[PDB]
């Protein structure tokens, strides 16, 4: 595939902190600093549903398509779940005594992870009345990002301002390992490469770097430099051999995942970039990113 980037749909809004694609409907969820969340059909450019969830920032939001839900987490410390077909608020609970930074949904089991400024990751089971099933303790600063290993989702990674990534096993109380990233301003984001040929993870930092890691040896494979302010995220695209990052410098960058050289820098004109999603099935090679002044959905080729 040749990079042939086309704007599918962009709209302005208050600052977009969380973003996610629905796997079967042509929908994107955005969660805003204002407490509002929006679901857009990016093919028809019509709003599916929107909710004023809270007056505090909503930093995290994901679809749970197999239950017809969205799950959101906000600076009022609460996790809320809504049925996107009816609008029903399914559950509303205090999850942590501090801000929620990140939510991840297990691909097959009824588990959600939340990472918080309270220094923990918590595991919630929606088949057990959203019970707290485990708290993962060990980090020493805000937990900014949680992600399951898609190839072994009995494990997951947490990225933390304490400058480490910890990889954990469900049901065990200490990390399988702690990765010292050398990203001395902390880790804002962690993501897994999805395919079985490389055991890779990627981290993004306020220190302006993105680092690729072999999680079997713990070695740094590569450091990607070029962003000029905090790097909010960096991810492997699920189908294309590229990495996509975004920054408070207002740019998205696309990097070759083999040579680690930048291939494209985009300034979509929405000021600082905060969040990313990739369409899981590679439908049209869609990506979406949220910014200070709205969001954009792009087809990469």
């Amino acid at each position: 595939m040749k990079l042939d980037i086309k704007k599918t749909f962009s709209n302005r809004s208050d600052r977009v902190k969380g973003i996610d694609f629905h796997p079967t409907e042509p929908w994107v969820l955005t969660t805003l600093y204002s407490g509002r969340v929006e679901i857009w059909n990016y093919e028809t450019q019509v709003e599916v549903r929107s909710i004023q969830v809270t007056e505090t920032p909503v930093r995290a939001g994901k679809f749970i398509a197999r239950k017809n839900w969205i799950i959101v987490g906000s600076d009022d410390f609460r996790i809320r779940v809504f049925n996107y077909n009816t609008g029903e608020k399914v559950v509303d609970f205090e999850a942590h005594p501090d801000y929620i930074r990140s939510i991840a949904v297990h691909p097959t089991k009824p588990y959600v992870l939340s990472g918080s400024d309270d220094l923990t990751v918590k595991l919630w089971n929606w088949e057990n009345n959203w019970a707290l099933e485990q708290t993962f303790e060990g980090h020493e600063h805000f937990v900014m990002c949680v992600a399951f290993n898609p190839k072994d989702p009995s494990t997951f990674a947490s990225g933390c301002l304490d400058r480490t990534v910890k990889v954990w096993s469900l049901g065990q109380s200490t990390p399988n390992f702690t990765l010292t990233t050398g990203q001395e301003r902390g880790v804002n984001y962690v993501d897994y490469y999805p395919l079985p040929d490389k055991p890779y993870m990627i981290t993004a930092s306020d220190d302006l770097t993105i680092k690729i890691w072999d999680y079997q040896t713990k070695s740094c494979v590569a450091t990607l430099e070029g962003h000029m302010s905090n790097v909010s995220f960096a991810v492997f695209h699920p189908t294309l051999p590229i990495i996509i990052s975004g920054s408070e410098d207002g740019t998205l960058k696309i990097w070759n995942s083999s040579t680690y050289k930048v291939e494209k820098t985009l300034n979509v004109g929405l000021e600082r970039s905060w969040c990313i999603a990739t369409h899981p099935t590679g439908r049209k090679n869609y990506i979406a990113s949220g910014f200070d002044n709205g969001f954009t959905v792009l087809s990469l080729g």
Partner: peptide, 6 residues
């Protein structure tokens, strides 16, 4: 102070 307040 809250770091990463924005």
């Amino acid at each position: 102070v809250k770091l990463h307040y924005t």
